């Protein structure tokens, strides 16, 4: 047995909390874990309106990981939307992390770029059923956060979780800021020296929706990582629906990249 | 028959409306109508503690959700421990809105022993216990400004009989709370009986809770008397965690008993 440091970041609309089952095995089985709140997210004390840079969601990881003493290694683990605060952390701190975990999330790289990634992740939020967005810049400007509605959640994200996960979601998401493309590429620059030297696995999870798994086998064939691994029956959060299989997933993944 | 019916579901200091997740899944699954809110700078509310030094800020959402209820409707409301302060206030200025309240482990003043007293015996089982601790932003002459619960004192007082991812996700969410004044308190929620007295009311006992002592629930009990005493044993303080179907079954009981 050697202990390790776990530390989790989640996708839009969610927080730390979105770990919990995770933490709570992790925890017990006696490994460090830091599940983290991105900028207006989970508990953090910025509103969406307060961080409209994308610097400004990441800051909570970036300072984070700034923190860390470069001996003290993590498995750093990124969910959907958390690709790219994890992309960046690699780019900055490469050092620090043993192996990066993509669950289901999205993966740039030098051949497929951070705002091709996000334009196509967008596209399956915006519009889709009760979401909606507002419009603090003013009517004639961009639509300034999105808000994931209820039925969404059911229908698309936690469609293969227990009943009480899907209330507990309902009473905690909060709005994304939607940042703009340009900004984001700005943000996301990755080189091969840093970003490509992190060892890499790529964790494909999702169920009846052939064309997400299709988006996430383009990220996989145009930023190749050293390792996929999938799970089976998983609806959008893997955490929720498939919490044990997760666990066992990641620590086989941590052993195996020490 | 099914009834239709509205519960309310107001949590304790340092949580939110997540705390009642099961219990608002098993409410919305059979069909009935639930709330569950955030009070001021709880759970995903935009306050912070240090913004709402005055305890009509912490206890608005509530306030406000009660005066938007449309007419003629009436509701279960449900308070646990803390939020017990905030029903007992609600109970007064709309005692027409509800059909019964409900005191989970709550801190139930009355005429006969007011809020401050209740108040100021709570504090002495939180403040000081474990690794809980204080902050003081408005500098060492003045009292201290919020009150941060520690992950030992939720493990040992608070969570000790629930699944261990409970208390997991109640160290990524709990929340400082603001260290109201007693002189505040006393103002704010005021009782009388033919307002607060005059509304359908039932305590629930959880039989292990190690947060607050059963002596100080049995003073409340006798010198303000409420309509019926319910028990659920096994439960830790937290019942909407460690005793979630057991809880639902007696507020779908109650709500039947007093529609
Ligand atoms: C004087 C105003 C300060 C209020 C004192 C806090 C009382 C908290 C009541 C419970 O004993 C603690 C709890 O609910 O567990 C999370
Ligand atoms: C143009 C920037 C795109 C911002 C929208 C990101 C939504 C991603 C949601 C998800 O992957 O769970």
New interface residues.
Partial sequence: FVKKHFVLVHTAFH???C???I??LM??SGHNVT?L?LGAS??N?K?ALQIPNFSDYLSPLMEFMASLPANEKIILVGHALGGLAISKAMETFPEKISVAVFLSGLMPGPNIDATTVCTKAGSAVLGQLDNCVTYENGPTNPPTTLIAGPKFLATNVYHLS???????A???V?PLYLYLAEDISKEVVLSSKRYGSVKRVFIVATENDALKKEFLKLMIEKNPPDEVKEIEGSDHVTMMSKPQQLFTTLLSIANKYK
């Fill in positions: 927080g730390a909390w770990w919990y089952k933490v709570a925890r017990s599940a709140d989970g508990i004390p509103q227990p009943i009480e996960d899907l209330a507990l309902t009473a905690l909060r």
